[PDB]
């Protein structure tokens, strides 16, 4: 800022950045469809696991 001796905007853009210093929050939105994806995952996985654990000894 003190490099520009003709400052005139640096307070403006500095308080503009400090204004938007709370930029935007993130997106932790998925907690319902993602658990359905891993629900189908655990479903078909335990189907496969029980079937192969049976058929190996079979």
């Amino acid at each position: 800022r003190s490099v520009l001796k003709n400052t005139s905007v640096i307070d403006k853009i500095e308080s503009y950045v400090k204004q938007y210093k709370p930029v935007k929050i993130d997106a932790s939105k998925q907690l319902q469809v993602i658990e359905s994806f891993e629900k189908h995952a655990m479903t078909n996985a335990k189907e496969t696991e029980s079937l192969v654990s049976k058929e190996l000894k079979d």
Partner: protein, 50 residues
């Protein structure tokens, strides 16, 4: 900051053509006459140093 340095350089070149204006101010004087005595007393000062 780029425009600041640009404005400094424009100030410097406008003072260069102002140096031209100062030279044209200095040209028409009896400083041409008086300054001979300047050299006189000066050369006295230089050669009296030794």
């Amino acid at each position: 900051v780029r425009y600041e340095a640009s404005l400094r350089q424009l100030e410097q070149r406008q003072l260069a053509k102002s140096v031209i204006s100062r030279v044209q101010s200095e040209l028409g004087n009896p400083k041409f006459q008086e300054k001979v005595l300047q050299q006189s007393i000066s050369e006295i000062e230089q050669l009296l140093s030794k």
